[PDB]
């Protein structure tokens, strides 16, 4: 039957107020084309009341009109919608298409209430299309290019439950299509050169944590956790970057650089018993190191304890003869007391407890690890990326974790070391140099295989991730494991925390 | 709209341009297409008379310009007017004439003339001398002229109308400097004449067929601006140290790690993380075939702790793709803080030899406790190599196994660009650096797997450049199958600076000839 | 719905240029016959985007 | 199928660019029920000339073909 | 040349539905007054494209 509505006027309203009244090509006027929001699906997974689609009047409902939209700044007029359903003889059901006037707002409507608006109902079996006029109910003379305007909408809902019979293959869905064309009342308004204007955003790579490279110790990432009893605001110098691409601290691009160094090596004689190698540091790509605006050469260790390093002749060409020695070097402050990576000079000793000229040192194990920064400049202030933070109340740092070999001395055992982003995300942000638009990004961590959402989190623009968690209590997450953006997100955005995954509930 | 300074310009400059008419007859508009076009689409009358700045709307004359220099070259089409250009995306075809207006108005102190000539479609491209320009219907004007010169761009046609393809050749309007520009007075050399070009369609002009507005995609893949010496090596876990070509090495290596296509297709055992490279994970135990438990039996798992299943690649991800005798350090897997750890060193033989066990592909390899402690689940990382040979190990004990193909082919004279790092090789009275090469740094491996670009032809032309100094070092071909070629004749490893950025190009057919550059000797004369 | 195209002219164009303009039997004019490229098939083996047929006037 | 033309008319030459009709699968074909993958939808195309159609010059050209090489389908 | 605009109506539209239509002191009616952002200067340093002023009715 016809809609319970009176015909709405077109251009006649905005004549004495718009600067121009611009007509459209009559060939568009009645050619039914697939709307940009031209698809939907109904499946037994849907429940009566589910909104299959929600359209709002505007030139954005027709591809042609849309193209013209980029040329004018206003519009007025009525459109015409046509809906199609590709059902079976096995698909029983009914859909409701209702016109919701502007000003009504948003509410949860029961299928019964959906009927109270001018509507059209159709059985999912129909071979023929359904037609519904989308009138331009106006409170104002006309419309401007603004999707913040409240225009009349078309809401399609499942009126009755979809009930497939026969050999019920739940992989069966009814395909729906929406098509439109403008009623001859339609008119664009002011001619504006506005022909082109877009933007961009930030995305993350779909790499699971357990496929990633760790940014502070050169090993795969093995763990993904939060742990309120660890230091909340660590002062990590590696694995630091901002979402905008700004690298901080000693953060290298390559994960092969992480916790490694290069030097010219020699054996001076202060004590005079040549067991101590003196390393004059160079950058690991063989270029000269100059004390600058970071604490040490790129990737130089940003923690303490006693590091066992293996030092080999630098490889320049095939046939370069190689010497390889092991040393222990002390990373922390102690004590009367030499070592200033920042100035370019560190000492290790031949775990006497061979090699010289130019060498490369890689980490072999740690002894007495402590995750605090070494004394980089022998007492003097030094340039440092800032402590990670702040966090809202109840927010804690998301940790990517790997294990160092710690030695002993009658016993080597795994020791945990954490970082704020995997090296792939370090490289990703340094490379994209995204434009940042607000203070943090809302991310979901999801299992893309199973579909399961594990949690939500905040990626602050300064390059660290927060979760809300009250426990006390390291909490560990599956590492397989993809992150997705979001939103932007103000900094006081409240994240969701959690529940006892048990759902059941009783009528009571 | 237009207000020339006539009122206050004194009479130092000419208002209107006095010139003989165009030696050319008027051309018909839409009348032609009416009978055969499917539709004749009218345009907004407001566009019909507004002289708007064309997309090719600016040009400049300066005393640096020499007569003959082309100020602008306009070819008839909707692309000459911003509004039309936008409507173009919606129609297929057009017919009609355009009205062009070039604007000048230099100081009363400047002198100089330009020439605009209409060139018929079918003439082709030729470098015209100012004198040649005279042979075409032309107009000449003094740069001081207040009022804009109007020139009709006639739609000379061989056919009834036009379509939106490259098979179309329309009429052109070439404007060149006729006489040198010279400012008199207190010559401020900052002085150049700023010209403007505006157009509007003649009422003859019409668009033709309505068509799906759009169809102007352009997915162009890029590379990250990371220098080689800042990169991670893809076949041995170390920084990249070297960038070279070397015609005396094997030209078509069968590398299983560091393989990806430009489109994002990973090949072989190529892992995403460079921490996985040349490493493995297993459950470890000590069986007793000999019965003297020095041999660890490793049942391989993937390094993210998931189960390894023999599949469509040669081994678990990142498993070594070369031979020799590898020294591995094997440690208890790290699961949680407090996991007690054992760490043992072993030597494992990677190559075929020989009666003769080891099938990474099936999930099972043996190493021996360099007796020459650890069990349950472990992780093994490479410590040094002994007797390296860069040929693939015997992955499946004699049987065929799935393999990424040999790298190649290359045109004649093209050789593989090598990213290089050094393994510690041991001895046995002497450890010395040993070279090992790969086709792309791991960052580029990850970059392509992540972007999944659309590829449009057979290779990309890249320049390697010093962005600091600006210097172009070379050009090269990045084949879509993920390896880079240079043309080089020497014999003769040739090494390049590692600081060192790559830039795309082009697409590039596969028979694109690269510049060899290189012989930096032009050895000969002339005169 | 109707095609988004304006009617295209016939013989009227080539009258003053072709040597002859030759008409056809009106019985062919509207009898729908199977084109020589008159067959195609769709099966689950096809993927959306597959070109079932490409005809040229 | 409209005769969009850039030229006055067409000559017997299949190198000419004329308007084309491309048929594509818009959505995936999804057979339900006792899915017999041996099931295919048969399609047929039929045509007839719009009254605007006209042939041009009368040429005796009545017969003109060629040949080619084939190999026998015998396995090695 | 003219301005590419059709003149727009004034109070004509209001009369019918506004409650009142209040006139203005005729002395203001055509007395040119300087606007708040009514000052700008063009130095040889400005390049074509630089914005001199912006106004909203």
UniProtKB/Swiss-Prot annotation, chains C, E:
Q: Which domain of life is it from?
A: Viruses
The similarity comment for this entry is: Belongs to the caliciviridae capsid protein family.
Q: By what name is this protein known? A: Capsid protein VP1
Swiss-Prot record, chain D:
- Signal sequence annotation: none
Q: Which domain of life is it from?
A: Viruses
Protein family:
Belongs to the caliciviridae capsid protein family.
Entry protein name = Capsid protein VP1
Organism annotation: Norovirus (strain Human/NoV/United States/Norwalk/1968/GI) (Hu/NV/NV/1968/US)
State the covered range within the intact protein. 162 to 221 of 530
């Amino acid at each position: 039957d016809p809609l319970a509505m009176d015909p709405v006027a077109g251009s006649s309203t905005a004549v004495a107020t718009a600067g121009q009244v611009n007509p459209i090509d009559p060939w568009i006027i009645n050619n039914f084309v697939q709307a940009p929001q031209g698809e939907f699906t109904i499946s037994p997974n849907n429940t009566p009341g589910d909104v299959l689609f929600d359209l709002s009047l505007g030139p954005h409902l027709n591809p042609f009109l849309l193209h013209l939209s980029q040329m004018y700044n206003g519009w007025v007029g009525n459109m015409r919608v046509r809906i199609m359903l590709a059902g079976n003889a096995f698909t029983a059901g009914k859909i409701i298409v209702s016109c919701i006037p502007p000003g009504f707002g948003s509410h949860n409507l029961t299928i019964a209430q959906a009927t109270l608006f001018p509507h059209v109902i159709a059985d999912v079996r129909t071979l023929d299309p359904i037609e519904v006029p989308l009138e331009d109910v106006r409170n104002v003379l006309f419309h401007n290019n603004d999707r913040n305007q409240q225009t009349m909408r078309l809401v399609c809902m499942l009126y009755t439950p979809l009930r497939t019979g026969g050999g019920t293959g739940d992989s069966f869905v009814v395909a729906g299509r929406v098509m439109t064309c403008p009623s001859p009342d339609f008119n664009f308004l002011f001619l504006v050169p506005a022909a082109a204007a877009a933007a961009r955003m930030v995305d993350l790579p779909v790499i699971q944590p357990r496929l990633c490279t760790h940014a502070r110790w050169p090993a795969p990432v093995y763990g993904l956790l939060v742990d309120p009893s660890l230091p909340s605001n660590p002062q990590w110098q590696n694995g630091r970057v901002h979402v905008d691409g700004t690298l901080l601290g000693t953060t290298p691009i390559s994960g092969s650089w992480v916790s490694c160094f290069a030097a010219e090596a020699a054996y001076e004689f202060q004590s005079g018993t040549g067991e101590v190698a003196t390393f004059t540091l160079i950058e690991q790509d063989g270029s000269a190191y100059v004390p600058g605006d970071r604490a040490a050469p790129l990737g130089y260790p940003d923690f303490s304890g006693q590091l066992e390093i293996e030092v080999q002749t630098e490889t320049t060409k095939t046939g370069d003869k190689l010497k390889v020695t092991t040393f222990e070097m002390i990373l922390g402050p102690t004590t009367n007391a030499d070592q200033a990576p920042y100035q370019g000079r560190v000492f290790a000793s031949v775990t006497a407890a061979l090699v010289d000229g130019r060498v490369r040192a890689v980490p072999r194990s740690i002894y007495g690890f402590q995750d605090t920064i070494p004394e980089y400049n022998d007492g003097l202030l030094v340039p440092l990326a800032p402590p990670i933070g702040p966090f809202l109340p109840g927010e804690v740092l998301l940790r990517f974790r790997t294990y160092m070999r710690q030695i002993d001395t009658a016993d080597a055992a795994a020791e945990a070391i954490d970082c704020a982003l995997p090296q792939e995300f370090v490289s990703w942000f340094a490379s994209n140099a995204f434009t940042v638009q607000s203070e943090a990004l809302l991310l979901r961590y999801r299992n893309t295989l199973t579909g399961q959402l594990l949690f939500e989190c905040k990626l602050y623009n300064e390059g660290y991730i927060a979760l809300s968690y009250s426990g006390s209590g390291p909490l560990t997450f599956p590492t397989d494991g993809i992150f997705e953006v979001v939103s932007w997100v103000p900094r006081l955005y409240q994240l969701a925390s959690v529940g006892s995954l048990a759902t059941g509930r009783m009528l009571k």
